[PDB]
Amino acid sequence: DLPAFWTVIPAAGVGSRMRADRPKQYLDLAGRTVIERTLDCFLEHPMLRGLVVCLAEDDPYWPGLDCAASRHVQRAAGGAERAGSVLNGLLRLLELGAQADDWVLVHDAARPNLTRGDLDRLLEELAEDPVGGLLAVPARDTLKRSDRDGRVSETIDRSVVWLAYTPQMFRLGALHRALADALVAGVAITDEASAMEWAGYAPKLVEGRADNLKITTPEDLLRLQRSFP
Amino acid sequence: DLPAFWTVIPAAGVGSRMRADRPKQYLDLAGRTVIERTLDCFLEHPMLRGLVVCLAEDDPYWPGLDCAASRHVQRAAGGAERAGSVLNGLLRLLELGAQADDWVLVHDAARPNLTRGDLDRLLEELAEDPVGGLLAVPARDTLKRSDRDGRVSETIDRSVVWLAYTPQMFRLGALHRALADALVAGVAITDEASAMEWAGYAPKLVEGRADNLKITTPEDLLRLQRSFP
């Protein structure tokens, strides 16, 4: 009994001009764009109520993709920052019949290697949580704290340190209020969990796979080019 | 005026039996083993006084490599843990004429992408430092601290968090005493910097390139397979 959920993929900030240095979400990953493979991670899930991609209105790459003509993929307008784009995605879900108590998953457009196991694991562990949570991976590299002169002040106990991944799973109404209030407050919002944390909540960490990586350099594609199929 | 230095490559812990799942230092990286490309990062440096690789006495892969028959590559016996193997490397340097005040660089055998720029940068910034230091990279992923129930207690300020890389550069005599004393003390030694930290010193962080990665999975090879030449 996995819970029903909506999905928001923030994918705005793309200029109106096509560039040789393409946005990472439109790079080729074994014959398909990154973002097309990212949507593949959700679109077939039986509990998906609907998916919204947040895009710049003048995105020049999106209208060429198959998913741009799919009724299973809704569209929302990008914001001034990622939080505002996520916010617009929430508003789009509200037009599509979403309820304040419905679960929403926000996921990076450049994380195309999300396995069904991780997705279902996140869904089952948080289904009856009062706030929600996020996929995350234990820190494996040795972590040093820097003093003001650039010298090691301490080696951080990485046994309690987790790298924050996506999807991040929260209730629609609460995430809507956290994001909206944190924006007007001037909070430096990174991910959705950072907004819930500012609003006073403690998101649950759900352990995922480390190879659910975000494509931040074209070099990161090379790690994934043998991961499909 | 870059300082003269010795190099220690800890590369022991290899069983006597060849295995299909080879040690990472013996995997192929564009036609050469990882460790052969790692040695390439130091062997031609004009200020290198000598290089010691720490190896299991019964290492079945090493005698097949070109560098196993190179007079420019010295050999030391592996220890019970990495620290002990590094320690044995220091003892080998002392037999080769090394002085207590000589700089020593310890580097991971599975970091074959160390560029000459990083190496020279480390050498010039620490040449007149009282203790030494290490290459390191700023943390770029969002970092969450976990409470005892697996919920986020805080988002760590990653502006002060650095991932510890190699080489790590310290004086021979001091590193010898730190490692020896920390072993008998029972300290959980990770890298050489962790031993200097326990001995009371604050290593200087020197910023390096992020793609000086350690090969921990065969997937990590894919990121580097286009990096040579």
Ligand SMILES: COC(=O)C[C@H]1c2cccnc2C(=O)N1C
């Ligand atoms: C430089 O591009 C980004 O940072 C992308 C980011 C962004 C910026 C501004 C508005 N919306 C967004 C959005 O959805 N993102 C995923």
Ligand SMILES: COC(=O)C[C@H]1c2cccnc2C(=O)N1C
């Ligand atoms: C599982 O292999 C390792 O952890 C490798 C490690 C090690 C272990 C035991 C003794 N010496 C060493 C050494 O030099 N290392 C680099």
